[PDB]
Amino acid sequence: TFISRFAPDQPRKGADILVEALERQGVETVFAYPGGASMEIHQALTRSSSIRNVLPRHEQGGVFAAEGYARSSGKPGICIATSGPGATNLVSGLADALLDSVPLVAITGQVPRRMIGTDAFQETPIVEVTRSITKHNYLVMDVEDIPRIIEEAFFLATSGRPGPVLVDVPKDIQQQLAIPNWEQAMRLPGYMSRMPKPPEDSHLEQIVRLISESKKPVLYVGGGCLNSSDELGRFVELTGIPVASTLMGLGSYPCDDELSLHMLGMHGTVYANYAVEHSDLLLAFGVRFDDRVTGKLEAFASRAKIVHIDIDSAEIGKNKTPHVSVCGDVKLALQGMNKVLENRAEELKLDFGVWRNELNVQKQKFPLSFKTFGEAIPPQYAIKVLDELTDGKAIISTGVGQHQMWAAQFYNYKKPRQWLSSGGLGAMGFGLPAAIGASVANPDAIVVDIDGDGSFIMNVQELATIRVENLPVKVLLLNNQHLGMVMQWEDRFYKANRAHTFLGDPAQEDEIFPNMLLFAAACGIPAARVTKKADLREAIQTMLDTPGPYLLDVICPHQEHVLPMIPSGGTFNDVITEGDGR
Amino acid sequence: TFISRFAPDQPRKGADILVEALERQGVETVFAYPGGASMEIHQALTRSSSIRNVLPRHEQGGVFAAEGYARSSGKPGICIATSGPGATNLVSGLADALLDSVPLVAITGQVPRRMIGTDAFQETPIVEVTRSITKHNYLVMDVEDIPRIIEEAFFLATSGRPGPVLVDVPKDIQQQLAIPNWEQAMRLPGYMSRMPKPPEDSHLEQIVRLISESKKPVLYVGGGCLNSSDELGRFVELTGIPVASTLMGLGSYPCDDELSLHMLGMHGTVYANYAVEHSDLLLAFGVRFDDRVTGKLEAFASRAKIVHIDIDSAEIGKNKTPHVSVCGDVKLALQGMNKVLENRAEELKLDFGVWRNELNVQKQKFPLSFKTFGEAIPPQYAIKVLDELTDGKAIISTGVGQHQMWAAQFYNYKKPRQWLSSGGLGAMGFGLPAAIGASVANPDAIVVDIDGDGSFIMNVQELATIRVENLPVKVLLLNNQHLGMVMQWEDRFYKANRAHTFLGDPAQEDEIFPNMLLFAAACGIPAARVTKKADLREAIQTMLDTPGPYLLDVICPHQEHVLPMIPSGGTFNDVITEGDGR
Amino acid sequence: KLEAFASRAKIVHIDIDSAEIGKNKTPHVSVCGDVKLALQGMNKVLENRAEELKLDFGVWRNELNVQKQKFPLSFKTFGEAIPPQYAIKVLDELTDGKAIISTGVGQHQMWAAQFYNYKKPRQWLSSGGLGAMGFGLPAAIGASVANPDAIVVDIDGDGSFIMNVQELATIRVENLPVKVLLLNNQHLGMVMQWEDRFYKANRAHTFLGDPAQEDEIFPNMLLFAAACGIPAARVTKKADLREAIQTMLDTPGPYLLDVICPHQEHVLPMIPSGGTFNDVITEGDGR
């Protein structure tokens, strides 16, 4: 039972109604950078004893932090920005959150209402700009709507298919006095009317049926199962079906597990893509048949009965047509199928050990492999050591590129919400701020940003934030002086012709440039470099043992190539398994 | 007569047609950060001998660089980005360019056409997102349209009221072979049909008439006169009317000149706002009656016959209703009025010396003034010294906040395109990248980014770009450890209650944090700090004399307040002239 | 052509919508506000400074009254055929210029503009910007309900009239005294006129009658009126016109008068689209 800081009949500013609306939602943390159009909100925040502001150094930093907070916790992330350039600096964060179905509530100051449309100081039509890159947005036109709109935005951000919701609040509404009414009903008739119902046993039994009739089943698991870790585990033991996961699903099913095919898709393991190529039953739980995963669709699971369980009806049959479909919460579907399974255990007598054996042969012929050249540090090996020394218990955020694939391939996520990575938009500069949010959400966790030198520098300014907020963020910076992923494609398809993919200084072409250690020094963050594979393990141990934030600059030969690789739009028969830039 | 690198009958990739389309436009410089959806364009660029790519470290860096290039030269600035997060990182740049009427051509890679709408890898509907923050945009749907669309985008970006135009190019169009047709006509019937005609002498004579009938005339000059420096100078000598300028007009009329009222508006000089308050004839040339400038509109030039000459009919009578109006190029209007004036010189016998005297009394009672406390460096003084030691010849870019007002107030711009500053959006992080573009456009100029510590850090990563491109950018970093402008408003209107406006480290509350010198060191840029006013002049001299880029960290007491200040929406009678945060 | 329009005038534009000011022609002076106030203010100044001004434009007014005399609006009368212009003029005469006039769109609309003398505003109800056919009959229905004691006449054309002919049911049932002066030429006349001037009188679907019985008035608008119990009559001879219209006016309740007219008439004068004054057509028709 909530206790306000205002008399139930005492008028207060709209800014204060808005902060209390946040408190009544359970918010403890927001990422807010102040500006003229949001100064009132920032004053109202200083008056809240229960909400902490982490002030970033760039609003993109702020929104990416709110994403990290969300992805690492299952709570919504909250960023606040001023109008104009404040608001426009959130846009990559919003698009990112929408594509990965991450729950986010973005609040932006706006010019006073009478000023809207007039090309006023620091005005941009942010509700127009973001309409196609948010799940929903709002322009508050009256202080009386603040309670109801905040409640609707949280409800839309976190229910159904989660995603970002943006609320534009004009400065004059922030200043208007009023007495909030917290009993207002929500105005979401259609949306609520279309929320999926719990699954019918009609559909659930038909699936358990198809399982027993099948000889080569594969689970195809994605971001939609991140709240189903236990149900999915139970489901796997009652059926012993092997588990392939998407980039977003990592850690739903434990990475180090005998039944685990690891990740599928363009950079999936040879065995996981094999399982799908030759399966007869494909259990697509919480996935969206993305082109990174399917390649040529006609070729994808070309001879499988496809069971698609998704909470968003628009996803069902959108790229691949399922045989069976179930529009609902995969967590419920698993709970129902698990009852049927355990009960009808005997009549079913489920044993796929013979299919599991065909795959463990591929798993043995074609494991993920890396070369070690001289004393040069292999990035794959560095991640593997980080896994070893953290006992697979760290929260890992990443940038985008080769280092991201390696952090996917060579770290064993045990639980969901350990892996924080931009999958759909693929936004560089995500790693450092996302670690900031994950740390604040998980103050006792090991938090490591496995970053690349291009991605890392894009939001390097957030090192100030880490230092000032005294967050124990570790940065494992895999440094190859290149935009490596674009470099790799230059190698395969453009005859290694380099078009602006080198990040160092051509004049001193053999010096590590820039010197990330000095970036850390500028913000008072202990840091070290390491070049010889011999020194790697003690280097990483040092990073882990040194209390507080820490940057480790890990130098790596740039000619590495993420493998395997099915070229864009290809089939399994096109999978590249060998080669690099040498 | 252009020479292609391809036979006139030889098919080439769409990417190559696009680069040649740029060459045929005169482009020599582009700011492009490569990604998957634009790799083809980057390969095509490496094949051009006449186009240089400055690779930034963040696409916001790239677009702000293209703005700097444009604003410092009068040529269009060209940035290129990949799809998805590349494109969304341009958005603040586009909005900025649109609000300041800066000519810009932004090219973004897009997913292949067949993929559009499918939530494909790194897809965002950028044409939707940017429609309201660009002058116009395009989604190329066929390689045959590349010549015509590039020609239309440059023509729209640079003609009329200049602004940003964005061209989205799907990856498959970049790869398609074709034979360009460079003779295609442009499809802009309506736009071309509505281009203003040259001014009629009917309207021009009526204005010169109103001048002779008037006793207290004021010129009100803005960004629209940046190509009219000579005509406007001539016009001022034939009439001796005093000249007030907006933030965007600085340097149209020379800052150090007896007839110069300097800048008007919310932080305008007391005398310039006085001239307007009490004028009877207001010559509004190339301005848009912005709220920063007018305050309460009914009070603005409340007793003046208002003559508004603007090239955009939508601006005329949009906030203040003119008596006379002229929709056309102010440069022509000046050339016409100058003929009438010089001819009818005798019959007119124009002498405003008595009004000019009333103003030179205000100019003497209420000049811009700053205090000097002990040995603490006053920011105003540092800018004045920079002016002295550069002889008013530097190109000055800035961030946003107090330091921006000071760079406006205490530097004497002699010509237009010396002052590069975000006026309408007011986007922090603009200064460093804008200096990068201005330097590349003006390789023999002194280029100085007068920046604040909040703004500077937002795009600190572009120091890598400065170093690698061996650009002689000087950074005069005015450091007060605060978001000073929001701090100032906290002081006046919120009882100095600080809500997240302190940028240093609360734990070591008296150390300069971060240490910008180490940011410079990381990128191999010579740097120094300075704290004592005694050392300032030799410090700045050093920065200027040291070849190549250079950062000077100038420490400043934070309690300074930009003055004078007419509070938002006020009248002249409300002008604050005294006070700070002490 | 805008460049040609008032090419040598100081233009004063008083409009209540700022978006209209300088949108197609650039004024010298502008005033964004209610023209009613602007007139009240200028009228005070005028009456006060009457003497110092000594305003006399009689010499310009004379230059124009010469044009007004050389080039008045004119129509031919062929035999006993009813000229539409004349029928409207008679309606004006017999109503004393006091009727509320709604119209359809086309030639008949221009004639109702040219040959009726509106004395006050809100007497003339006509679709000007969209130019929507079928507007006349329903618009008269609304005007009648708003002005139950007024003479209400829908000066309509046979194409426009039929488009919303169903509203005759409404007139009858609501017992509205709507009079219909239907100028009938069996053609989409305005498109016909343009066919004549610019397409060599080649007819593309502008004939509204029955090609099989090519000389019978088709349809028979009198029966449309009969279906809804509205008294109606036709008239073909100019001799019978004045008594016909008088009958329509004197018969209480709604009434339809079908006025047959030679179709070769042309609304004049005409400045062709996008032209200047120097291009004004003043003579000619479809004969």
Ligand SMILES: Cc1cc2nc3c(=O)[nH]c(=O)nc-3n(C[C@H](O)[C@H](O)[C@H](O)COP(=O)(O)OP(=O)(O)OC[C@H]3O[C@@H](n4cnc5c(N)ncnc54)[C@H](O)[C@@H]3O)c2cc1C
């Ligand atoms: C450089 C790079 C390379 C990449 N290559 C690969 C690759 O080789 N393999 C790969 O897998 N990815 C790859 N991607 C990532 C990729 O583009 C997509 O982000 C990923 O494939 C999609 O993950 P997903 O299918 O799990 O769907 P998500 O984006 O995780 O969406 C979850 C789905 O589940 C649904 N859902 C959500 N909640 C529930 C619920 N409670 N119940 C039921 N359904 C729910 C949503 O409606 C949606 O359909 C790569 C990314 C990058 C940057």
Ligand SMILES: Cc1cc2nc3c(=O)[nH]c(=O)nc-3n(C[C@H](O)[C@H](O)[C@H](O)COP(=O)(O)OP(=O)(O)OC[C@H]3O[C@@H](n4cnc5c(N)ncnc54)[C@H](O)[C@@H]3O)c2cc1C
């Ligand atoms: C912190 C801060 C404080 C500020 N305070 C002030 C202040 O005190 N004073 C101030 O002046 N600004 C101030 N501003 C800047 C402000 O918000 C606007 O950017 C500025 O007032 C508008 O400049 P402008 O009127 O010249 O119009 P611009 O944005 O420069 O537009 C130019 C105008 O001229 C027209 N035009 C362009 N080319 C031509 C041509 N060839 N012929 C004719 N017309 C043409 C365009 O159609 C447009 O109407 C401040 C900004 C910030 C960030």
Ligand SMILES: Cc1ncc(C[n+]2c([C@@](C)(O)OO)sc(CCOP(=O)(O)OP(=O)(O)O)c2C)c(N)n1
């Ligand atoms: C904001 C932004 N701009 C450009 C991008 C386009 N991409 C990529 C891709 C995969 O999306 O292909 O397009 S990955 C990549 C290069 C990675 O830089 P690194 O981290 O230092 O090196 P690493 O060795 O790969 O680990 C670029 C330039 C992007 N996604 N985001």
Ligand SMILES: Cc1ncc(C[n+]2c([C@@](C)(O)OO)sc(CCOP(=O)(O)OP(=O)(O)O)c2C)c(N)n1
């Ligand atoms: C991307 C962005 N985010 C927030 C902004 C809102 N504003 C400002 C304003 C004037 O627009 O009022 O809103 S100015 C300002 C603080 C200036 O930081 P400094 O340069 O280090 O210090 P200085 O001492 O003022 O020189 C902020 C936070 C902005 N415009 N852009």
Ligand SMILES: Cc1ncc(C[n+]2c([C@@](C)(O)OO)sc(CCOP(=O)(O)OP(=O)(O)O)c2C)c(N)n1
């Ligand atoms: C819904 C609709 N459809 C077609 C139209 C296009 N126009 C016209 C115009 C002037 O807009 O030129 O386009 S006028 C006209 C023909 C008039 O038919 P009439 O009333 O019986 O004959 P009258 O002898 O001209 O009085 C047509 C077909 C229109 N405006 N509205």
Ligand SMILES: COc1cc(C)nc(NC(=O)NS(=O)(=O)c2ccccc2OCCCF)n1
């Ligand atoms: C230098 O200018 C500053 C600086 C600071 C710190 N704050 C303010 N505040 C206001 O201008 N408030 S405003 O009156 O409501 C207003 C009036 C008109 C258009 C937009 C408005 O608000 C949004 C503007 C940014 F806030 N202005």
Ligand SMILES: COc1cc(C)nc(NC(=O)NS(=O)(=O)c2ccccc2OCCCF)n1
């Ligand atoms: C890791 O994935 C990478 C990495 C790199 C460097 N490049 C590519 N290129 C393609 O995917 N080209 S694509 O086939 O036309 C394509 C297919 C589907 C959706 C979008 C597509 O393009 C835009 C994607 C980004 F480019 N993919």
Ligand SMILES: [Mg+2]
């Ligand atoms: Mg790298």
Ligand SMILES: [Mg+2]
């Ligand atoms: Mg500062």
Ligand SMILES: [Mg+2]
């Ligand atoms: Mg007709």
